[PDB]
RNA sequence: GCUUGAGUCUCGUAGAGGGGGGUAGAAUUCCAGGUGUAGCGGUGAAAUGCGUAGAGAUCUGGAGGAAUACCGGUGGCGAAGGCGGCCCCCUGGACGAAGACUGACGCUCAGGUGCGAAAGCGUGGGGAGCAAACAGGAUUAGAUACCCUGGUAGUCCACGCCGUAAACGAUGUCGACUUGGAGGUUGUGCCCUUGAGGCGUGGCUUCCGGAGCUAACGCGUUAAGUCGACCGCCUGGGGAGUACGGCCGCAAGGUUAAAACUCAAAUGAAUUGACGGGGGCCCGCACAAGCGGUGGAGCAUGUGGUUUAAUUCGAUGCAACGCG
RNA sequence: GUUCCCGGGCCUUGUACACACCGUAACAAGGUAACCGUAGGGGAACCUGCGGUUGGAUCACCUCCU
């Protein structure tokens, strides 16, 4: 808001792994403020996705994160008067603020079973490039190349 | 007028055409004559042409900002 | 090679040229301190770091 | 046809129209292309993008003739004059030389009139 | 009688200064011929028109017609108006170094005379472009109005008539006097024009200022500062810078130039607000990226309307509707 | 991040306004700048052509060379 050049604040790291990528995903997957109730679910989800993927509970999350993390977010920043989108290379901190946002929007759609299992599906789908999670990431990337003449 | 350059271009290079007149005589032989017009607008133009030099004289003596 | 750090490029001559007066002595360029004195004394201008 | 290599593309951009007329040095025309004959009716003909489409409609209708070292004789510094000569140098043409052959009048006769 | 006033000659320069005629070149309308396409043109948009009877577009040859991009400079000439290729002849006005003289021969005005952009018209020719009256399509409730395509008058060459203006740097004219700077334009004298200059003098013109004037803005050696000489104009606005009459005109009118009545102001300079689909910067979750809702559903509450024996009154854009 | 959008402030430009923003021709550039002179025309304002002047407005942005 007109002055902020401030970055990101502090969050409590995960009580298991030294990954705070995972630590941000829990605060976004929770609802009605209940983080304890939400964190135990991420655990029962991260296990079965890694169990259906082929590797460990940490790389089966980072390697499954590259398939759902864009590089571009196009924003409305005009120079003249016409209406066009400008391909904006986004900061690395917001890139995750794109991935672990749709994966959550995935855990709230697809009426499968428990939350830990529907999530275990959508990121396992991302681990094999499929599903609604990885799907929206594809769509944003398509929003970039069609507007890459305006520089 | 005529730009050529045998090989190092990878560009059209019409910079002397614009450096000639281009719109110079376009703006003068495209619409109605009206003989007096330029005279008046060169009037406001000339006074503002001396004004920047008046700004050159306005920056040399003080500006203790 | 500075007038603010050392002195006048020429005798009573400011860096920017705000003082092309060989009468001006002492008065500095208010942008950056250019105390106008003889440029020949710049064979004795001692500075530091 | 014509056995021509010197495709003289007379690019004339009036105000709201980019009419390019490829011919020969003798005058034997090959055909034309226009920012208005391709569509874009309105302030759209006024855009060099239509003049770009123009240089492309002019980039064709010559694949039966064979212009290679072409001459770009420009007149009419209106809508074209920019993304038109550049479109030819982007359409696969080796322009021997871009010419601005403007036999400007000394304003002998009286011209029309516009915006009042 | 004598000279600082007026004036001319010897010796020179520059110029959209005027005048008669002739000529060069491009562009445009159009004509003939070869090529060739289905669009050109125009506007915020549409449309009249042209088009297989081949337009627009390209090259060559060419006849009318008017006008000179770039050199172009709040620059030059002139009483003013006004006026931009070149050449031949004619020629007015302005200015200067060094001398020669009559010796104030100087200034201006009612009646009077001359110039007079552009336009109206008469006459021998003309019509490319633009374009009064007018026609078609639209903006529109309407168009005789912004726009486009056509088009009579006019525009041009030569002779005249009515003899008019913001004919306005609004500054009447001859002249003398009054600290400077940036300059521009055109000559000249002196010193080695070694050199892109230094020191003075006249014409025209622009900006900032002192003296002084002034309501103020500002003018400021070209004055609105200081005087003398000559003429015209004003007595609040409107009526009206008009009718009619003298004089003049083929036509359109022109010059000199009022009254009755009514109103109690007309006008100018200079400032702060109101508003701006004018410019710049900044602030608030205004927006960008996300989370939860009203509206579809349930409960409680409220207002208008309706009805009733009565269903108090008030607020009733944001700031009324769990408010009293 | 201030270039989009709603409201606000400061500086600034402009006004025949201060009683304070049948047809729009002037006052913001009134989205067509104004007035004088002349001929003609239309219910009518005024408009079209020609000559002049300032009693007119911004010279702020978007692409290129040091």
Author numbering:
A (entry chain J): 1 to 151
B (entry chain X): 4 to 68
C (entry chain 04): 57 to 105
D (entry chain N): 12 to 127
Manuscript excerpt for this entry:
In bacteria, coupling of transcription and translation coordinates optimal gene expression and maintains genome stability. Coupling is thought to involve direct interactions between RNA polymerase (RNAP) and the translational machinery to allow cellular co-localization for efficient translation initiation and to prevent RNAP from backtracking during transcription elongation. We find that RNAP binds the 30S subunit with high affinity and report cryo-EM structures of the 30S•RNAP complex. We next visualized the 30S•RNAP complex using single-particle electron cryo-microscopy (cryo-EM) at ~7 Å resolution. Strong density shows RNAP docked near the mRNA-binding site of the 30S subunit between the head and platform domains.
Maximum likelihood classification reveals conformational rearrangements of RNAP adopting two conformations on the 30S subunit. The two states are related to each other by ~7° rotation around an axis positioned near the Zn-finger motif. The rotation widens the nucleic-acid-binding cleft of RNAP, as the β and β’ subunits move apart by at least 3 Å. Both conformations are intermediate between the open free E. coli RNAP core and the closed holoenzyme (bound with σ-factor) or closed elongating RNAP (i.e., bound with DNA and RNA). Consistent with our cross-linking results, the β′- and β-subunits of RNAP form two primary contacts with the 30S subunit. The N-terminal Zn-finger domain of the β′ subunit interacts extensively with ribosomal proteins S2 and S21 and with hairpin-loop 40 (h40) of 16S rRNA. The second binding site between RNAP and 30S is formed by hydrophobic packing of the β-subunit flap helix (β-flap) residues Leu901, Leu902, Ile905, and Phe906 onto S18 residues Phe10, Phe13, Val40, and Ile44. Elongated density connects the β′ subunit of RNAP to the Shine-Dalgarno binding site at the 3′ tail of 16S rRNA. We were able to model oligonucleotide-binding (OB) domains 2 and 3 of S1 into this density, consistent with studies showing that S1 domain 2 interacts with the 30S subunit and with our crosslinking experiments showing that aa 272 of S1 domain 3 is in close proximity to aa 420 of RNAP β-subunit. Remarkably, the RNA exit tunnel of RNAP lies next to the Shine-Dalgarno binding site on the 30S subunit. The 30S subunit is stabilized in an open conformation, with proteins S7 (head) and S11 (platform) separated by ~15 Å, allowing access to the mRNA path from the E to A site.
